[PDB]
Design a protein around this ligand. Structure first.
Ligand SMILES: [Mg+2]
Ligand SMILES: [Mg+2]
Ligand SMILES: [Mg+2]
Ligand SMILES: [Mg+2]
Ligand SMILES: [Mg+2]
Ligand SMILES: [Mg+2]
Ligand SMILES: [Mg+2]
Ligand SMILES: [Mg+2]
Ligand SMILES: [Mg+2]
Ligand SMILES: [Mg+2]
Ligand SMILES: [Mg+2]
Ligand SMILES: [Mg+2]
Ligand SMILES: [Mg+2]
Ligand SMILES: [Mg+2]
Ligand SMILES: [Mg+2]
Ligand SMILES: [Mg+2]
Ligand SMILES: [Mg+2]
Ligand SMILES: [Mg+2]
Ligand SMILES: [Mg+2]
Ligand SMILES: [Mg+2]
Ligand SMILES: [Mg+2]
Ligand SMILES: [Mg+2]
Ligand SMILES: [Mg+2]
Lengths: 123, 129, 205, 47, 82, 157, 80
RNA sequence: UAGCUAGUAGGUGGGGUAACGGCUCACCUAGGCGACGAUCCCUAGCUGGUCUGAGAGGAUGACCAGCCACACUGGAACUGA
RNA sequence: CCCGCAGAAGAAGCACCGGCUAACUCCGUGCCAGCAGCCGCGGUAAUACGGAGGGUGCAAGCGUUAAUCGGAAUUACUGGGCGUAAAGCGCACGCAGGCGGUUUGUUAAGUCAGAUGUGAAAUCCCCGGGCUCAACCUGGGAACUGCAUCUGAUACUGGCAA
């Protein structure tokens, strides 16, 4: 705090960690998506979260979250991973872009359809 | 031992008024008189005395316009651990002009307003406010 | 772009006449314009501190028919244009040609003036223009193309301007249907109620 | 679709083994009044 | 070889040339010794469309500069006072 | 004529034998638009009954603090117990841009200006008492002329 | 008048050379303090007269060696 | 990452480059850098500027422009101002 | 760029509505399906889920991730703390380093002022113009917080001397 102490050891600006290790921190990534399973949340919540373990193109095997209502994913069929941890799941720090590669949009969805990638009811 | 006796002068001025005293006495030197002469002109104080042959004791008489002291805050600026030397274009305007900022210019120890009239720059001693 | 929906609904949220359908009627006198903002019309809102600061800025845009993207650039321009920013923001919105044609009286509404200016009918300094956002410089003239003279709308809108405040920062002749912008409007020269300091503080954060 | 439970191998019983999984944990409902029914703001805090 | 040529600023189809003292190796808009004046071809009745320090150009042509053809013909248009 | 403004209203409890009793606390400020500001805290057991107990404590304890033309005089540091409040003159900067609870105590004072940043812990009861301390610690050009220098023409120019 | 610098000799024996070090006062650009700072040079001198720990005068010359371009002008004192 | 360096620090004479110089040799003297951080490891083109910020700073340097570096990888020389 | 058409004719969507943060209620599902940025909502009267009515925020663009800065005075030089919240080394001696009472003389490195050279142009900023005007283009200045040299001031700081 003394000025003579700051010319010696400068005011060391700490650095924060990146919330998502998406490697070079690029908007989305593409992974093959092995092991599509379900999980139960933390203590206050109680549900059956649709979770997938994505083998990213970098080489990582981070897990992701299929946010939506209906999913038709398999042990393959590449998907597009988007940042954002949920809250109540351990280790889940990514989302799935519904409406991309082989991840179809949510059937029966007409209120936030750009989220979840539903086209439009034509008129 | 004391490092900057000039910062001791302001400490006598601050604590003297805080204790509600009529006058204070401190060991004298050239600069303590020179800043007192600035404070005497500016009205922040009543007359001083440097009476004493071998041990000059500087004796400032404090000033109270009302029940509250006149010298509200008197902050040392160019302390020895961090000496500041501002130029003509960046002399501070303490309390937007409602307080002085005593500078030591090459032409002498002056207030900031008179040194700005003089067009000089120097060591920023204190912020008498 | 431009808001193209129901016009009184904008004036219904502000609880005041935004002159969007300003003509030979009072309000409409029959559709509840005092207090029935939407469906929940009896629901009297409290309007927290942000909701007041938003609503004042929303009032001005609905008056002058501008959009947020172009409005923020007026704020940036007003903030560098010396002096009181809030008056300068009012100096710019009054400087729009789209407002000038309205104040001259050729517009029944600014929406009529927006169509009239855009459909190649108005000439500033003998130069035809189409931009609604033309900043009318001081000591200039505004006029109409003669093929746009006698359109039976520039007549009808001009009569209603007699029932207006007759602004003094600009004068108008009605012979050859042209007017002259004279000086910048002062803050006290108009509007008397449209707050400006709430707009500055909104963008101040 | 397939529930991932927290036990690697399963021997001698499926339904009974899932009974000691956190899927079938006890769910205690936080009561609205009485013991353990205090809330800071609740669901809509307008005063 | 030092020469006095033109740059090409401005937008597409609306150019603003700049009479510039540059070595004749660098590109159209590259490094230059000293920008001396300008030019505006699509200028009609405004300010000048062409203003350039003829006292400076004589200082360069004496040292060994080369006046480019479009430059010399524009100097010819603004000879000394005509 | 006064322009009272409610700032914050919360709910404190006591915890007696069979439960806790939610007494409500209010925090209002009456003003003048001229320089007289006073905050009345108050608290009761009902919400509209607590502001009335806050309206009275405000009016009886208003402090008359002078000011130039709708703005503060010099920069001032209103520190009080949780907040290191700073207010800056902001000459004709046409905005009462300030934090929560600092906007209310200034726009009833008749300030159509001053920039203000609330350092330290933001706390409504304290940040109101911070600026009230901050305005009282501000001196008039005539007031500083009275105690030193002795000419408002001299000290200012 | 030609450019020249003072400085005190730190290292002595170099076989027809010497090493000086100039104390210079730099205001730290962030914190602000007139910090004493030292730059070492390699100073040539014919007649190796000046020893160690003495204030000399150097001027910048044509480079006489690998990172050695300074030379001696005068000497204010040799030793007390 | 705490000791690092032996053509390395410097001198005398020869040679060499457009040009000074360990740039390169012979001999001689043992020094040189080092907590104001040497060597080593990792990462990275630099600057005008750019994006933010009240300011101070922080982060980053695509386009436009100056400089440097590279031209399948490693190395060398010729021609030529 | 200017003129003509029995022609409004070819051109409006996108998130959000518990609070933070503008914006309200009903049906269907009942801690199941799902929402999320944070606090946290859903357990058969949900304005927080899904779908409709309206409402708001923006608009040929919105919304979500991603990166930096701001908010963050949560790296504090401007501008923070250390009895108990994280923090005074167990204590002391002590080199380098940092700072240092008072008087006078001197020098003028630090400091301050003025001039010169340079600080490329462009960009940013301020007055002026030009494409129907704005983005953009652009003339003239300011600025480029700097560095160096020279000439002075020389109180304060430093060196030297008594
Ligand atoms: Mg647009
Ligand atoms: Mg009571
Ligand atoms: Mg060399
Ligand atoms: Mg040799
Ligand atoms: Mg590229
Ligand atoms: Mg380039
Ligand atoms: Mg080159
Ligand atoms: Mg090769
Ligand atoms: Mg029709
Ligand atoms: Mg939602
Ligand atoms: Mg709903
Ligand atoms: Mg952050
Ligand atoms: Mg702290
Ligand atoms: Mg403890
Ligand atoms: Mg202890
Ligand atoms: Mg010592
Ligand atoms: Mg100078
Ligand atoms: Mg100069
Ligand atoms: Mg123009
Ligand atoms: Mg220009
Ligand atoms: Mg300057
Ligand atoms: Mg003297
Ligand atoms: Mg010192």
């Amino acid at each position: 705090a003394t000025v003579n102490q700051l010319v010696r050891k400068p005011r060391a600006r700490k650095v924060a960690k990146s919330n998502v290790p998406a490697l070079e921190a690029c908007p989305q990534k593409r992974g093959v998506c092995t092991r599509v399973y379900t999980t139960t949340p933390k203590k206050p919540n109680s549900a059956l979260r649709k979770v997938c373990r994505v083998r990213l193109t970098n080489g990582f095997e981070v897990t992701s979250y299929i946010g939506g209502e209906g999913h038709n994913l398999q042990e393959h069929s590449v998907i597009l991973i988007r940042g954002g941890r949920v809250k109540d799941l351990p280790g889940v720090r990514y989302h799935t872009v519904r409406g991309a590669l082989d991840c179809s949009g949510v059937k029966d969805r007409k209120q936030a359809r750009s989220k979840y990638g539903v086209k439009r009811p034509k008129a | 031992s004391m490092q900057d006796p000039i910062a001791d002068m302001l400490t006598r001025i601050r604590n003297g008024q805080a204790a509600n005293k009529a006058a204070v006495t401190m060991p004298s030197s050239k600069l303590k008189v020179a800043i007192a002469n600035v404070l005497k002109e500016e009205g922040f104080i009543e007359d001083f005395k440097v009476e004493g042959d071998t041990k000059p004791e500087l004796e400032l008489t404090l000033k109270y316009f009302q029940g509250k002291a006149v010298v509200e805050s008197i902050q040392r600026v160019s302390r020895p651990g961090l000496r500041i030397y501002k130029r003509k274009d960046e002399l501070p305007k303490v309390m937007a002009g409602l307080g002085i900022a005593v500078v030591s210019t090459s032409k002498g120890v002056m207030t900031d307003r008179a040194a700005r009239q003089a067009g000089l720059g120097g060591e920023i001693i204190c912020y008498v406010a | 772009a431009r808001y193209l929906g129901p016009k009184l609904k904008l004036s219904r949220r502000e609880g005041t006449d935004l002159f969007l359908k300003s003509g030979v009627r009072a309000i409409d006198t029959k559709c509840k314009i005092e207090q029935a903002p939407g469906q929940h019309g009896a629901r009297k809102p409290r309007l927290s501190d942000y909701g007041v600061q938003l609503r004042e800025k929303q009032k001005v845009r609905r008056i002058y028919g501008v959009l947020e993207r172009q409005f923020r650039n007026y704020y940036k321009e007003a903030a560098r244009l010396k002096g009181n920013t809030g008056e300068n923001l009012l100096a710019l919105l009054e400087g729009r040609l789209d407002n000038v044609v309205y104040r001259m009286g050729f517009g029944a509404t600014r929406a009529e003036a927006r169509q009239l200016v855009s459909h190649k009918a108005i000439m500033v300094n003998g130069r035809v223009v189409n931009i609604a956002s033309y900043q009318v410089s001081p000591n200039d003239v505004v006029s109409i193309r003669e093929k746009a003279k006698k359109q039976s709308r520039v007549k009808a809108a001009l009569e209603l301007a007699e029932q207006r405040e007759k602004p003094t920062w600009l004068e108008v002749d009605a012979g050859k249907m042209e007017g002259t912008f004279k000086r910048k409007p002062e803050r006290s020269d108009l509007s008397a109620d449209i707050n400006e300091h709430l707009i500055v503080e909104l963008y101040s954060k | 679709s397939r529930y991932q439970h927290t036990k690697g191998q399963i021997k001698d019983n499926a339904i009974e083994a899932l009974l000691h999984d956190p899927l079938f944990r006890q769910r205690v409902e936080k009561n609205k009044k009485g013991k353990g029914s205090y809330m800071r703001k609740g669901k809509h805090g307008n005063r | 070889m030092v020469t006095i040529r033109l740059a090409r600023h401005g937008a597409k189809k609306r150019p603003f040339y700049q009479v510039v003292v540059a070595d004749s190796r660098n590109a159209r808009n590259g490094r230059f010794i000293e920008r001396v004046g300008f030019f505006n071809p699509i200028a009609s009745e405004k300010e000048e469309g062409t203003r350039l320090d003829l006292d400076r150009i004589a200082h360069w042509v004496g040292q060994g500069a080369t006046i480019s053809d479009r430059v010399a013909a524009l100097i010819k248009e603004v000879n000394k006072a005509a | 004529e006064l322009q009272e403004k409610l700032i914050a209203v919360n709910r404190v409890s006591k915890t007696v034998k069979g439960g806790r009793i939610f007494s409500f606390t209010a925090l209002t400020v009456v003003g003048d638009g001229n320089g007289r500001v006073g905050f009345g805290y108050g608290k009761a057991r009902e919400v509209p009954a607590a502001i009335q107990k806050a309206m009275e404590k405000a009016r009886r304890n208003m402090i008359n603090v002078a000011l130039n033309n709708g703005t503060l005089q010099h920069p001032v540091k209103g520190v009080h117990t949780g907040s290191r409040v700073f207010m800056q003159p902001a000459s004709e900067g046409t905005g009462i841009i300030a934090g929560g609870a600092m906007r209310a105590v200034l726009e009833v004072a008749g300030v159509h200006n001053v920039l203000a940043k609330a350092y330290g812990s933001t706390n409504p009861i304290n940040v109101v008492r911070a600026t009230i301390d901050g305005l009282e610690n501000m001196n008039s050009p005539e007031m500083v002329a009275a105690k030193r220098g002795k000419s408002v023409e001299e000290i200012l120019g | 008048k030609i450019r020249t610098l003072q400085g005190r000799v730190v290292s002595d024996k170099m076989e027809k050379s010497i090493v000086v070090a100039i104390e210079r006062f730099v205001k730290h650009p962030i914190y602000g303090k007139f910090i004493k700072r030292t730059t070492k040079l390699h100073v040539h001198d014919e007649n190796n007269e000046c020893g160690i720990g003495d204030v000399v005068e150097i001027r910048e010359c044509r480079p006489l060696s690998k990172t050695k371009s300074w030379t001696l002008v005068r000497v204010v004192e040799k030793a007390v």
